[PDB]
Each structure stands twice: as structure tokens, then as C-alpha cells.
């Protein structure tokens, strides 16, 4: 290591947007996170989020009938 121009590597606590205490190292000691691996939709399985099957559209709109045959 050409020490004299490189930043420190202090042990970093990382409190995330889920109560996570992600134990690792970093340049900044106390950094907080919005989302991590532990709660992202495209990370932990297929998940759901808001999107279920794309609105009521379109062959399943329902809200009407007039057939009995």
C-alpha cells in the first residue's frame, strides 16, 4: 500500500432503513441507509410491492354481466 494519499479504513457501523446493523468496514464511521438487501423487492424473492396483476385491465375488468347461455 502506497500510504500517504489513501483514506482511512475505520470499522463502520451501518444502521439501515429496517433497523439493520450491517457490520462491515467503510471510510465513513456512522452512515445510514435507505434500503438494503434485507427488504428490497428485487432482492428477497419475487416479492409483491403494490403491483399485483396490472390494474383491473383488461379481460378481467368485471363490473358488468348480461349473459346466461
Amino acid at each position: 500500500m502506497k500510504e500517504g494519499i489513501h483514506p482511512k479504513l475505520v470499522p463502520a457501523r451501518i444502521i439501515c432503513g429496517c433497523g439493520n446493523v450491517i457490520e462491515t468496514y467503510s471510510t465513513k464511521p456512522e452512515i445510514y441507509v435507505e434500503v438494503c438487501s434485507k427488504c428490497h423487492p428485487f432482492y428477497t424473492g419475487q416479492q409483491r410491492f403494490v403491483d399485483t396483476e396490472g390494474r383491473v385491465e383488461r379481460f378481467q375488468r368485471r363490473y358488468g354481466d348480461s349473459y346466461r347461455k
Binding site: 500500500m1 502506497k2 494519499i5 489513501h6 483514506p7 482511512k8 479504513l9 451501518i14 439501515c16 450491517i22 457490520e23 462491515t24 468496514y25 467503510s26 471510510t27 465513513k28 452512515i31 445510514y32 441507509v33 435507505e34 434500503v35 438494503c36 438487501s37 428490497h40 428485487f42 432482492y43
Partner: protein, 181 residues
């Protein structure tokens, strides 16, 4: 060495799982990382101020090591670019400093991006390498709001001993790399 969750996840889980899948007859035949190379292709500050010298600070902030400069191979007129004139930053991450990157990237950084839908699986090299792009550098938590004056992306490149993408896809998917399909 160093207590790093990723360094552990590889050895104490991923590595033997790789042997489970493909079955090697030597301990070294098992695929592993070696380099992680980041390349902000700035070049915007070509004949302009060393505005890139701040981007160096940003980059080092993420890696824990200073990036060197890259300069113009040939000269190109269309690009308003004279040969030798500086246009980019490269920082290579080997050994322990590498792990700390991925351990932060895969955990914190990646999901914090705009509409993450999982890494593109087609983006695989051939002889066992994987490359991707970032447009924003504030994605990493070490980067704050006022630390940024413009969005500067980067060409993350990670290499492996793998013979092919099969091992590579396998190696990374077990590590913490999401995929689309």
C-alpha cells in the same frame, strides 16, 4: 486477513456449494474473484478544470484507496480531445479492500438505485468476467448530498478465475448478485 461477511460467505458457504454443483478435483479449480476495477470515464473535464480531482475524492471515498489517472491514447478531433490529455479514473481493488467493496455494494449500494430490476444476466463476458454500469455515484452511502456537484457514473468490472459464464453466473448469484430472468 479480515472479518468480512462476504469473505466468509464465499468460503463458508458459496465455495463448497460451487463444488456441489460442478465438482472439482482440486481446491484451486474453484472459481474466485481477483480484481475489482472501477472506471469513471469522465473525459468531460478534458481541456477543462481538474473538476475530476473532486471525483477522485469521491471515488477514493468509496474504495478506501486513491485512484490513478488515465490519459488519452490517441488524439480525436471529433471529441474535442488531444492525445495525452487526461480523461478518466481507474482504481483496481484486490484482496481485502475488494471484499469491503462488494460487501457494501451488494448490500447497501445496489438496491438504492432508481428502479432496480436485477442485474442483466446477458452482460456476461465469456471467459468468466462480468461488467456493469452506474450513472450516479451518490448511490453509495459514503457519498452525501452536498458532497455531490454532478452525477458521475462508473464502469464497475469484476473478474474471476472461471472458465466460463456458467461458473461465473453461479459464483455471483450465490454471492449476492441479483438477476432479471
Amino acid at each position: 486477513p479480515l472479518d468480512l461477511a462476504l469473505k466468509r460467505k464465499y468460503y463458508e458457504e458459496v465455495r463448497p456449494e460451487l463444488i456441489r454443483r460442478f465438482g472439482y478435483q482440486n481446491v484451486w479449480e474453484v472459481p474466485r474473484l481477483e480484481k475489482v476495477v472501477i472506471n469513471q470515464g469522465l473525459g468531460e473535464a478534458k481541456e477543462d478544470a481538474r473538476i475530476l480531482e473532486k471525483a477522485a475524492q469521491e471515488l477514493a471515498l468509496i474504495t478506501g484507496q486513491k485512484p490513478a489517472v488515465t490519459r488519452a491514447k490517441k488524439s480525436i478531433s471529433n471529441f474535442k480531445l488531444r492525445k495525452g490529455m487526461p480523461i478518466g479514473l481507474r482504481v483496481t481493488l484486490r484482496r481485502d479492500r475488494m471484499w469491503i467493496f462488494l460487501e457494501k455494494l451488494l448490500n447497501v449500494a445496489l438496491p438504492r438505485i432508481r428502479d432496480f430490476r436485477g442485474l442483466n444476466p446477458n452482460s456476461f463476458d465469456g471467459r468468466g468476467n462480468y461488467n456493469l454500469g452506474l450513472r450516479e455515484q451518490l448511490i453509495f452511502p459514503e457519498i452525501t448530498y452536498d458532497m455531490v456537484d454532478a452525477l458521475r457514473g462508473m464502469d464497475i468490472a469484476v473478474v474471476t478465475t472461471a472458465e466460463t459464464d456458467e461458473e461465473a453466473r453461479a459464483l455471483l448469484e450465490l454471492l449476492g448478485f441479483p438477476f432479471r430472468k
